[PDB]
Motif scaffolding. Structure first.
Motif, PDB file in Angstrom:
ATOM      1  N   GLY A  29       0.815  -1.207   0.000  1.00  0.00           N
ATOM      2  CA  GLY A  29       0.000   0.000   0.000  1.00  0.00           C
ATOM      3  C   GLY A  29       0.852   1.262   0.000  1.00  0.00           C
ATOM      4  N   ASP A  30       0.310   2.333   0.596  1.00  0.00           N
ATOM      5  CA  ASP A  30       1.032   3.610   0.780  1.00  0.00           C
ATOM      6  C   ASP A  30       1.479   3.809   2.230  1.00  0.00           C
ATOM      7  OD1 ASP A  30      -1.633   4.170   1.758  1.00  0.00           O
ATOM      8  OD2 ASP A  30      -2.147   5.146  -0.113  1.00  0.00           O
ATOM      9  N   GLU A  31       2.228   4.889   2.452  1.00  0.00           N
ATOM     10  CA  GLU A  31       2.635   5.324   3.794  1.00  0.00           C
ATOM     11  C   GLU A  31       1.423   5.466   4.728  1.00  0.00           C
ATOM     12  OE1 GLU A  31       3.875   6.578   0.779  1.00  0.00           O
ATOM     13  OE2 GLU A  31       5.582   7.900   1.208  1.00  0.00           O
ATOM     14  N   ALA A  32       0.305   5.968   4.197  1.00  0.00           N
ATOM     15  CA  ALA A  32      -0.918   6.213   4.980  1.00  0.00           C
ATOM     16  C   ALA A  32      -1.479   4.914   5.574  1.00  0.00           C
ATOM     17  CB  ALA A  32      -1.974   6.903   4.121  1.00  0.00           C
ATOM     18  N   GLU A  33      -1.567   3.876   4.749  1.00  0.00           N
ATOM     19  CA  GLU A  33      -1.996   2.543   5.190  1.00  0.00           C
ATOM     20  C   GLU A  33      -1.011   1.862   6.126  1.00  0.00           C
ATOM     21  OE1 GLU A  33      -3.206   0.325   1.561  1.00  0.00           O
ATOM     22  OE2 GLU A  33      -3.931   2.321   0.954  1.00  0.00           O
ATOM     23  N   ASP A  34       0.292   2.064   5.918  1.00  0.00           N
ATOM     24  CA  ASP A  34       1.288   1.504   6.825  1.00  0.00           C
ATOM     25  C   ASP A  34       1.163   2.113   8.228  1.00  0.00           C
ATOM     26  OD1 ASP A  34       4.013  -0.146   7.109  1.00  0.00           O
ATOM     27  OD2 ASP A  34       4.386   1.823   8.017  1.00  0.00           O
ATOM     28  N   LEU A  93     -11.424  -0.563   7.545  1.00  0.00           N
ATOM     29  CA  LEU A  93     -11.959  -0.217   6.227  1.00  0.00           C
ATOM     30  C   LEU A  93     -10.892   0.484   5.356  1.00  0.00           C
ATOM     31  CD1 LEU A  93     -15.559   0.912   7.105  1.00  0.00           C
ATOM     32  CD2 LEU A  93     -14.661  -1.335   6.512  1.00  0.00           C
ATOM     33  N   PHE A  94     -10.082   1.368   5.946  1.00  0.00           N
ATOM     34  CA  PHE A  94      -9.147   2.192   5.176  1.00  0.00           C
ATOM     35  C   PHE A  94      -7.964   1.374   4.651  1.00  0.00           C
ATOM     36  CE2 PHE A  94      -5.321   4.862   5.001  1.00  0.00           C
ATOM     37  CZ  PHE A  94      -5.715   5.874   4.115  1.00  0.00           C
ATOM     38  N   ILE A  95      -7.548   0.349   5.394  1.00  0.00           N
ATOM     39  CA  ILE A  95      -6.436  -0.484   4.923  1.00  0.00           C
ATOM     40  C   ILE A  95      -6.897  -1.672   4.081  1.00  0.00           C
ATOM     41  CG2 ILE A  95      -4.781   0.179   6.743  1.00  0.00           C
ATOM     42  CD1 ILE A  95      -5.293  -2.368   8.167  1.00  0.00           C
ATOM     43  N   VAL A  96      -8.083  -1.629   3.468  1.00  0.00           N
ATOM     44  CA  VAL A  96      -8.403  -2.591   2.392  1.00  0.00           C
ATOM     45  C   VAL A  96      -7.168  -2.813   1.517  1.00  0.00           C
ATOM     46  CG1 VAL A  96     -10.768  -2.926   1.574  1.00  0.00           C
ATOM     47  CG2 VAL A  96      -9.760  -0.644   1.430  1.00  0.00           C
ATOM     48  N   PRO A  97      -6.791  -4.072   1.275  1.00  0.00           N
ATOM     49  CA  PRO A  97      -5.668  -4.294   0.344  1.00  0.00           C
ATOM     50  C   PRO A  97      -6.008  -3.979  -1.143  1.00  0.00           C
ATOM     51  CG  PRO A  97      -6.647  -6.374   0.987  1.00  0.00           C
ATOM     52  CD  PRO A  97      -7.328  -5.331   1.822  1.00  0.00           C
ATOM     53  N   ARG A  98      -5.021  -3.478  -1.893  1.00  0.00           N
ATOM     54  CA  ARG A  98      -5.205  -3.156  -3.332  1.00  0.00           C
ATOM     55  C   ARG A  98      -5.639  -4.356  -4.186  1.00  0.00           C
ATOM     56  NH1 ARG A  98       0.515  -2.141  -2.872  1.00  0.00           N
ATOM     57  NH2 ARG A  98       1.685  -4.023  -3.451  1.00  0.00           N
ATOM     58  N   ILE A 141       5.242   6.526  -6.053  1.00  0.00           N
ATOM     59  CA  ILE A 141       4.347   5.535  -5.439  1.00  0.00           C
ATOM     60  C   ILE A 141       3.403   4.894  -6.499  1.00  0.00           C
ATOM     61  CG2 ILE A 141       2.581   7.187  -4.573  1.00  0.00           C
ATOM     62  CD1 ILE A 141       2.980   5.366  -1.835  1.00  0.00           C
ATOM     63  N   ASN A 142       3.405   3.558  -6.542  1.00  0.00           N
ATOM     64  CA  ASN A 142       2.716   2.749  -7.564  1.00  0.00           C
ATOM     65  C   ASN A 142       1.306   3.209  -7.933  1.00  0.00           C
ATOM     66  OD1 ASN A 142       1.559   1.988  -5.098  1.00  0.00           O
ATOM     67  ND2 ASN A 142       2.244  -0.158  -5.190  1.00  0.00           N
ATOM     68  N   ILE A 143       1.024   3.310  -9.236  1.00  0.00           N
ATOM     69  CA  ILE A 143      -0.299   3.771  -9.715  1.00  0.00           C
ATOM     70  C   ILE A 143      -1.453   2.920  -9.152  1.00  0.00           C
ATOM     71  CG2 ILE A 143      -0.422   2.445 -11.880  1.00  0.00           C
ATOM     72  CD1 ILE A 143      -1.755   6.045 -11.243  1.00  0.00           C
ATOM     73  N   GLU A 144      -1.167   1.661  -8.828  1.00  0.00           N
ATOM     74  CA  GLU A 144      -2.189   0.735  -8.340  1.00  0.00           C
ATOM     75  C   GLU A 144      -2.782   1.070  -6.964  1.00  0.00           C
ATOM     76  OE1 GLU A 144      -1.358  -3.111  -9.685  1.00  0.00           O
ATOM     77  OE2 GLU A 144      -2.610  -4.103  -8.152  1.00  0.00           O
ATOM     78  N   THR A 145      -1.954   1.576  -6.041  1.00  0.00           N
ATOM     79  CA  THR A 145      -2.447   2.096  -4.746  1.00  0.00           C
ATOM     80  C   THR A 145      -3.280   3.355  -4.945  1.00  0.00           C
ATOM     81  OG1 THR A 145      -0.417   1.388  -3.609  1.00  0.00           O
ATOM     82  CG2 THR A 145      -1.873   2.936  -2.439  1.00  0.00           C
ATOM     83  N   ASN A 147      -5.011   4.185  -7.461  1.00  0.00           N
ATOM     84  CA  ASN A 147      -6.290   3.742  -8.027  1.00  0.00           C
ATOM     85  C   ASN A 147      -7.233   3.124  -6.972  1.00  0.00           C
ATOM     86  OD1 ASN A 147      -5.742   4.726 -10.687  1.00  0.00           O
ATOM     87  ND2 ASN A 147      -4.960   2.725 -11.412  1.00  0.00           N
ATOM     88  N   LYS A 148      -6.694   2.422  -5.965  1.00  0.00           N
ATOM     89  CA  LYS A 148      -7.480   1.979  -4.827  1.00  0.00           C
ATOM     90  C   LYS A 148      -8.109   3.190  -4.123  1.00  0.00           C
ATOM     91  CE  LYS A 148      -6.478   2.034  -0.657  1.00  0.00           C
ATOM     92  NZ  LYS A 148      -7.425   2.479   0.426  1.00  0.00           N
ATOM     93  N   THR A 149      -7.306   4.207  -3.804  1.00  0.00           N
ATOM     94  CA  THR A 149      -7.834   5.382  -3.116  1.00  0.00           C
ATOM     95  C   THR A 149      -8.949   6.003  -3.937  1.00  0.00           C
ATOM     96  OG1 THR A 149      -5.783   5.958  -1.944  1.00  0.00           O
ATOM     97  CG2 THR A 149      -7.371   7.692  -2.282  1.00  0.00           C
ATOM     98  N   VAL A 150      -8.697   6.208  -5.230  1.00  0.00           N
ATOM     99  CA  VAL A 150      -9.646   6.891  -6.099  1.00  0.00           C
ATOM    100  C   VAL A 150     -10.877   6.042  -6.321  1.00  0.00           C
ATOM    101  CG1 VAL A 150     -10.036   7.403  -8.546  1.00  0.00           C
ATOM    102  CG2 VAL A 150      -8.289   8.653  -7.304  1.00  0.00           C
ATOM    103  N   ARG A 151     -10.736   4.722  -6.433  1.00  0.00           N
ATOM    104  CA  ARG A 151     -11.930   3.849  -6.530  1.00  0.00           C
ATOM    105  C   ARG A 151     -12.820   3.897  -5.278  1.00  0.00           C
ATOM    106  NH1 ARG A 151     -10.881   0.313 -11.353  1.00  0.00           N
ATOM    107  NH2 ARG A 151      -8.603  -0.045 -11.296  1.00  0.00           N
ATOM    108  N   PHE A 152     -12.193   3.928  -4.101  1.00  0.00           N
ATOM    109  CA  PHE A 152     -12.921   3.990  -2.820  1.00  0.00           C
ATOM    110  C   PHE A 152     -13.705   5.291  -2.756  1.00  0.00           C
ATOM    111  CE2 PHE A 152     -12.204   2.008   1.723  1.00  0.00           C
ATOM    112  CZ  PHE A 152     -13.588   1.893   1.887  1.00  0.00           C
ATOM    113  N   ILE A 153     -13.094   6.412  -3.127  1.00  0.00           N
ATOM    114  CA  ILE A 153     -13.829   7.672  -3.205  1.00  0.00           C
ATOM    115  C   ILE A 153     -15.013   7.590  -4.176  1.00  0.00           C
ATOM    116  CG2 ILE A 153     -13.733  10.059  -3.923  1.00  0.00           C
ATOM    117  CD1 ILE A 153     -10.743  10.060  -2.690  1.00  0.00           C
ATOM    118  N   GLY A 154     -14.804   6.870  -5.279  1.00  0.00           N
ATOM    119  CA  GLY A 154     -15.883   6.705  -6.248  1.00  0.00           C
ATOM    120  C   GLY A 154     -17.057   5.952  -5.690  1.00  0.00           C
ATOM    121  N   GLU A 155     -16.789   4.865  -4.990  1.00  0.00           N
ATOM    122  CA  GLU A 155     -17.887   4.039  -4.417  1.00  0.00           C
ATOM    123  C   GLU A 155     -18.683   4.832  -3.356  1.00  0.00           C
ATOM    124  OE1 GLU A 155     -19.218   1.338  -5.323  1.00  0.00           O
ATOM    125  OE2 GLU A 155     -17.846   1.224  -7.001  1.00  0.00           O
TER     126      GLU A 155
END
Length: 240
Positions: A29-34, A93-98, A141-145, A147-155
């Motif tokens: 994940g990111d620093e925030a999730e760690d 909820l916030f540390i959902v894995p990518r 920082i990897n585009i895939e993390t 995209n997790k953040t941005v998808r969660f905001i979308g939902e």
């Protein structure tokens, strides 16, 4: 017609009415999730209650349908509601894995289902998601993390836990420095909730303006071919 299906209309609009119930380089994940994960890890009718909550949180990743996630909400709301426990929920909820993007819609349903009788779960998660978004928009920082953040905001937007105006600001920020990582975050965001925004009368006009600015920018700004095609696909996905 804002939704494609009838399943969608029900998944996003027909929530269980809980208010009927009792008032009761880095090792990332990111620093925030760690950072969040380490706060969770640091920590006798409360030792029993803690035990059942840690069970509950560890089971969330298995709530992969509408009925399972609604049950989880009833269970939490009736046996586990506790300031300390609401903070642990938010953080789990916030540390959902990518690698479990499939959870995001259910996790959003949980949050929106709880909101009418413990709004602070929504407030904290959204605040966390906003801050991580800001962080992603500033770095490269990897585009895939991201995209997790941005998808969660979308939902969450589809559930009205983020307002249209919130998420439109997200999109506007990404269009101001329309660079490689920001273009993808943008296109992920629009795949997740662009139709909701475009179809909703409140947001239609501003979504449309912004969709046309992205299309104007792919020509105008000479992006390389891969991102020209990405922007086109997100556009035609919202506004076919």
């Amino acid at each position: 017609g804002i939704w494609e299906d009838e399943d969608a209309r029900n998944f996003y609009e027909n929530l269980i009415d809980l208010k009927a119930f009792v008032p009761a380089t880095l090792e990332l994940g990111d620093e925030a999730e760690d950072l969040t994960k380490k706060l969770l890890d640091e920590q006798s009718t409360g030792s029993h209650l803690k035990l059942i909550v840690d069970a509950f949180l560890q089971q969330l990743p298995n709530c992969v349908n509408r009925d399972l996630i609604d049950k989880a909400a009833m269970d939490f709301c009736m046996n586990m509601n506790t300031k300390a426990n609401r903070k642990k929920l938010v953080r789990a909820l916030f540390i959902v894995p990518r690698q479990r993007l499939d959870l995001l819609p259910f996790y959003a349903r949980l949050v929106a289902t709880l909101h009418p009788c413990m709004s602070d779960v929504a407030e904290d998660l959204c605040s966390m998601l906003r801050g991580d978004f800001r962080f992603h928009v500033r770095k490269k920082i990897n585009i895939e993390t991201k995209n997790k953040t941005v998808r969660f905001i979308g939902e969450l937007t589809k559930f009205k836990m983020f307002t249209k105006n919130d998420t439109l600001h997200c999109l506007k920020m990404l269009l101001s420095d329309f660079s490689h990582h920001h273009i993808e975050m943008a296109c992920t965001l629009l795949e997740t909730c662009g139709r909701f925004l475009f179809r909703s009368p409140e947001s239609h006009l501003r979504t449309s303006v912004l969709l046309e600015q992205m299309m104007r920018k792919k020509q105008a700004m000479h992006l390389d071919a891969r991102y020209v095609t990405m922007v086109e696909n997100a556009y035609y996905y919202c506004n076919p």
